[PDB]
Amino acid sequence: DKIRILWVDDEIDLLKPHILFLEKKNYEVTTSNNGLDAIALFEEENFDIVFLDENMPGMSGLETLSEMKEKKSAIPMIMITKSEEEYIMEEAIGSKIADYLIKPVNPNQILLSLKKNLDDSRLITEKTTLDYQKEFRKISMELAMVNSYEDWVELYKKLLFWELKLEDINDQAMIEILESQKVEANSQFGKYIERNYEDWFAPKADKPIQSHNLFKELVVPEIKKKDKPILFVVIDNLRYDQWKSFETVISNYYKLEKEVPYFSILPTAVQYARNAIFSGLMPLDMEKQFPQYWKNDVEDGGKNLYEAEFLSAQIKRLGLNIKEDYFKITNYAGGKKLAENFKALKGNDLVTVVYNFVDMLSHAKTEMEVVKELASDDKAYRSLTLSWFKNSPLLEIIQQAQLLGFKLILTTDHGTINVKNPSKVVGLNLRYKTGRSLTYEQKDVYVVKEPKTIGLPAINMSSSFIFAKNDFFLAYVNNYNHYVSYYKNTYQHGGISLEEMIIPFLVFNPK
Amino acid sequence: DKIRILWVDDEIDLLKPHILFLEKKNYEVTTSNNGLDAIALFEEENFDIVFLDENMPGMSGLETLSEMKEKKSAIPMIMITKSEEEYIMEEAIGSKIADYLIKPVNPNQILLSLKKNLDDSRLITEKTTLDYQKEFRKISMELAMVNSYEDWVELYKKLLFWELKLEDINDQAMIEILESQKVEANSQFGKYIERNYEDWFAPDKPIQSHNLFKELVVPEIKKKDKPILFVVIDNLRYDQWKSFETVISNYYKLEKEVPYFSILPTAVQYARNAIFSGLMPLDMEKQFPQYWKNDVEDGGKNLYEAEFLSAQIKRLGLNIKEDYFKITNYAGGKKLAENFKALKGNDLVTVVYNFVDMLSHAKTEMEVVKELASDDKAYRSLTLSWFKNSPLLEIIQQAQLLGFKLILTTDHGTINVKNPSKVNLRYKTGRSDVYVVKEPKTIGLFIFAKNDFFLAYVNNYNHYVSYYKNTYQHGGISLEEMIIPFLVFNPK
Ligand SMILES: [Ca+2]
Ligand SMILES: [Ca+2]
Ligand SMILES: [Ca+2]
Ligand SMILES: [Ca+2]
Structure with missing residues (x-):
């Protein structure tokens, strides 16, 4: 099969050199002098690509394009014209032209456009x-x-x-x-x-930026600038890959000023990591200074119900008298509500939004065959995430902030990994455990006998911490087979993995 | 905001005209004579677009591109050079270049490329x-x-x-x-x-569910040129098809597309069975009481499709090797992908894929799906994500290798119901805004919701409205439900 080109120009008799060039390149060119002939050619015959002049006696190229696109929207159309008018350029670009070549054209430039618009995916x-x-x-x-x-x-x-x-x-x-x-x-x-991990908590020993460090070290700088209002969003359970899958979408609204990969603290779980970000204190210190706010695993209810209080304290502790508000989105309506009322949040110097959909989506694969098929592999999960964000109420919140000229700080607390291999345990997150009578495969997990060393609570001195490595899920020995069938190939967090610990910090100035 | 350009060329002084031209158009241009210095500028500052020469003393433009793309993959990159070699063109296009301008270049061509790659969405x-x-x-x-x-x-x-x-x-x-x-x-x-609808059953009517196999499919098989894959995607709206038609193109060329009208009620039980049987629910009950089921009956209503289909093949007086599979889950679809190899010698392969129906009603219940499919755009976007990574695509990708002709159709679509109708939420079978059919006999079988109406029982009206408002429901009369696509594709 040779590629069939439809070239429409009033002066097509003058462009025969170019046609002869394409001919030797095994490109078949059918010519027309009027748009009406071209539409007739386009309807009768099946072309791969179309070249159109703009200024043509009769129907203009753009008029001919529109007619043709109504019939066959898939066919790429390129404009080859002498018109250098900025306004004509814009109209054709808005008409979804595949390329626009200004005459006189180098014949190989047309070849470039043919390759680029017809063989790009293969190349x-x-x-x-x-x-x-x-x-x-x-x-x-x-x-x-x-x-x-x-x-x-x-x-x-x-x-x-x-x-x-x-x-x-x-x-x-x-x-x-x-x-x-x-x-x-x-x-x-x-x-x-x-x-x-442990040695990082030794005074002054070189450590990365971590959960409990994030606010004071990275966000507080941006606020001291006092140049713009800041929307500080925390998307729970966002893997680096997932961010990368919608980075181009965010670009349509926000220019990236700064990107710092940072390490989530262990356990890589909302209860510990997120609270750390908002408190600037490690879980242990949060237990000490805010027993009214801290909640151990044993305690019932929510574990992140007082993030606003911790945060306000940190802002007060860092001696910043600013206007600040906190929103925790946990469902569609909540997000859609905040989007439609974000206007009211103009006066605020700082707006913190917590979004929990991806964590909810991640765990849904464990309970829904729908999400199983929609997120069979990481690629699928990325594709699913992109579909979400492109249609997410969060994007509407982001778009609203851009309109109000807010600086955007996008971050997370941790990621998730598709667990594949079971590890037996007796004594939760399926990637981390705490307690006294703990039985574990030690080759499979990272054990911390003294939790207070890694800034973690210890109900008793006996209590310790275990963190699954690689793609291991901690499976209780009671009902082991059932644990394995249910949690195999599911996204679980709380343990040590690239996917979980290494997460993004992103700052964007509004466009 | 002025758009920042990073232009790298060994002869960057010979390009002073161009830079001056761009600058007048309020374009900020930073120049460099070598890729390494450019890479440094690329990291230190945040530019909006980068222009690159290929033939450069030092690193080539393509080398500089690769290094830069690893460091900031988002930023658009344009190549401006004299190279006319097909291989250099090919390498740039393989390197995901945005555009490639061959020197000497018209300054306006650069401007078009700037707008095209940076302002197209707005335009x-x-x-x-x-x-x-x-x-x-x-x-x-x-x-x-x-x-x-x-x-x-x-x-x-x-x-x-x-x-x-x-x-x-x-x-x-x-x-x-x-x-x-x-x-x-x-x-x-x-x-x-x-x-x-009634008169259509009196001896001009469109192609319908009871007529699809004999009128459209049977001909394509009589040709006896290729093996055939007959896929039925349950509950697939025309817009959903349009959303992934690009993807299907990469594998199958469309030979024929025929919109047909699903029979009322637009529900798998009645419609999909007819597609495989070629009989109306009334006649389906009469001819095959052994295989038919009414609303009152218990269990799945479409386990006898293979039997009906085999029967239709016999009733149409054809003898070919035939098979029927009903995929209802991930494992099932991923299983059939590898084993699809083996069944090639058999003439026709029928695959029923029921994932899309499952997704539709999942929104009725799960908050996850509610966000993933809040509006039609999102629902179409979700379908595109699915298909792109579905076992069905692998089934299709298998068939093309085996040189199978693909026939893709559905039984019905679904509509976002928004308005309640006081009394499956689009058809009912006993007397209690709507299409009334006093005689089921006439239409070969009732109430039919039209116009995004959901039938709500009067006993629990409030709760039915609160739960089933803005949920995808099928079984009634709507373009979204009745007008459904029939496609035949020759393998690429
Ligand atoms: Ca002309
Ligand atoms: Ca979680
Ligand atoms: Ca050069
Ligand atoms: Ca259904």
């Missing part, structure tokens, strides 16, 4: 497949060399890059290679954390 | 809105003119066209006009059906 597939084949060995090498949290952040960035690049690939072999590297990554990372 | 919003503003009155007029089923089929195509076009627009006025026309459409359509 990307080909390039991606080849470029990875020349990188995966190097990826393996780098992973075995990793020795720092900064090196872990860089390698995660690389892994994420290739993950989303290989979702436009067909070669399963390369995908299995990448999955293998991601597995080895978590394996090595968990050992790294198992070896370094 | 398209403006153009789309204005195009509709000047077309909606014509659309209303055609709607006031429609008086045939072919007329209805065409206006539906028009409405669907504008639906997908205006989904991203901001002008609420125009959005509400489209909704008005959509409402009026089903209103007038329901009257059309109410006034012609």
Whole structure:
């Protein structure tokens, strides 16, 4: 099959050089001098692409385009004209032109547009497949060399890059290679954390930015600037990948000023991590200073019901007299309400919004076959997340903030991992446990006998902490088989994994 | 805000004309003579677009691109160079370049590329809105003119066209006009059906559920040229199809598309069974009491489709090797993907995929699905996500390799019910806004909700309204439900 081109121009007899060029390139060009002939050609015959002049005696190119797009919206249409008017350019771009070439045109420029608009998807597939084949060995090498949290952040960035690049690939072999590297990554990372996590709490020992540090170190800078109002959003349970899946969407509204990967504290759970962000204190300290607000695992009810109170305290503790408000979105109506009334929040210097949909979506796979099919693999989960955010009430809140000229700070508390392998436990989050009579496979988990060392509560001195590594889910020995069937291939958090601990901090200035 | 350009070229002084031109158009341009310095500027500051020469002393533009894209993948990158080599063009397009301008370049070509890659969304919003503003009155007029089923089929195509076009627009006025026309459409359509559905069963009627297999499918098999994959997606609206038609194109070329009218009530029990049997519910009950089930009966109503289908093949006097599969879950669909290989020698493969129906009513209950499918746009977006990553696509991807012709259809669609009707929420079977059929015999079988109505029992009216308001329901008369797609595709 040769590519069939329909070229419409009043002076088409003058462009025969170009036609002869495309001819040798095995491109078949049918010509027309009027739009009406072209529509007739377009309706009768099945073309792959269409070239149109704008200034044509009779129907204009744009008029002809509109008619044709009504009939066959899939066919790419390129404009080749002498018109240099900015306004004509804009009308055609808005008419969803595939390219606009100003005459006189280099024949190879038309070839560029033909390749770009007809073979791009294949070229990307080909390039991606080849470029990875020349990188995966190097990826393996780098992973075995990793020795720092900064090196872990860089390698995660690389892994994420290739993950989303290989979702436009067909070669399963390369995908299995990448999955293998991601597995080895978590394996090595968990050992790294198992070896370094405690020492990070030694005074002055070089530690990354963590949950309890986030506000004072990263947000408080932005507020001191006193240049703009700030919307500080916390999307619960957002994996780095998921952010990357909707980064282009956010771009349509917000320019990224700053991105800092930061490490969630253990356990990587809402109860501990999020409260830490809002308090600027570690869970243990929150237990000490705010027993009225803190809630241990044993305690019933919500565990993050007093985030606003912790936060207001931190702002007061940091001696900032500012206007601040706090919203915790837990459902559609709540988010839609806040979106339609965000206007009222103009006066505030700071607006903090907590959003919980993705955590809810993540856990839904455990309970819904619908979400099972919609989030079969990470790619699917990314695609599902993108569908959400593109139609999310949160985006309406973000769009509203942009209109009000608010600076946007997007962050999370932790991520989630698709657990695949069961680990037996006797004595929750299925990735972390605390208690006295704890039985565990120690090769499978990171044990902290003295929790107060890692800034965690300890009901008793006996009490300790266990954190599942890699893709392990802690399964109680009672009803082991049932635990395994129900939680296998489900998103669980609270443990140590790249997906869970390394999460994004993002600052955006309004466009 | 001025747009910041990062332009890298070895001969960046030879490009002073261009830079001056851009600058006058309020474009801020930062220049560099080498990729390495450019990479540094790319990281240190936040630019909006980057221009790159290929042939450069030092790192090539493509090398500089790769390094930059790893550091900030969002930023659009344009290549401006003399290289005419097909391979360099190909590498840039494989490298996800936004545009590639061959030197010497017209300064306006650069400007077009700047606008095209940075302001297109806004321009398209403006153009789309204005195009509709000047077309909606014509659309209303055609709607006031429609008086045939072919007329209805065409206006539906028009409405669907504008639906997908205006989904991203901001002008609420125009959005509400489209909704008005959509409402009026089903209103007038329901009257059309109410006034012609009965007569259609008297010896000009459209293709319907009881006629689909013999009138459309049977011919395509008589050709005896290729093996056939006959997929029935339960509860698939035309808009949903349109949302993933791009994806299907990457694998299957559309040979034929025929809108047909689902039989009333638009429910799998009655409609999908007819598709496989070629009989109306009344006749289905008479000929196969062994296989038919009424509303009063217990259990699944479409376990006998394979038997009905085999029967229809026999009743049509054809003998071919046939199989029937009903996918109802992820495992089931992912299973059939690998084993689809084996069944190639068998002539026809029928796959029933019921995931879409499941998704529709999930919104009725789960807050997750409520956010994922709050509006039609979101529902279409959700369908596109699904299909792109579905075992069904793998089934289709298998068939093309096996050189199967694909026939894709549904049994009915679903509509966002919003208004309650005091008394499945779109059809009922005993006497208690609506299409009344005193004799089920005449229509080969009742009440029929029209116009986004949900039938609510009077005993628990309030609760039915609160729970089933703004939920996808099927079984009644609406364009969204009755006018459904029949597609035949030859493998690519
Ligand atoms: Ca002309
Ligand atoms: Ca959770
Ligand atoms: Ca050069
Ligand atoms: Ca249903």
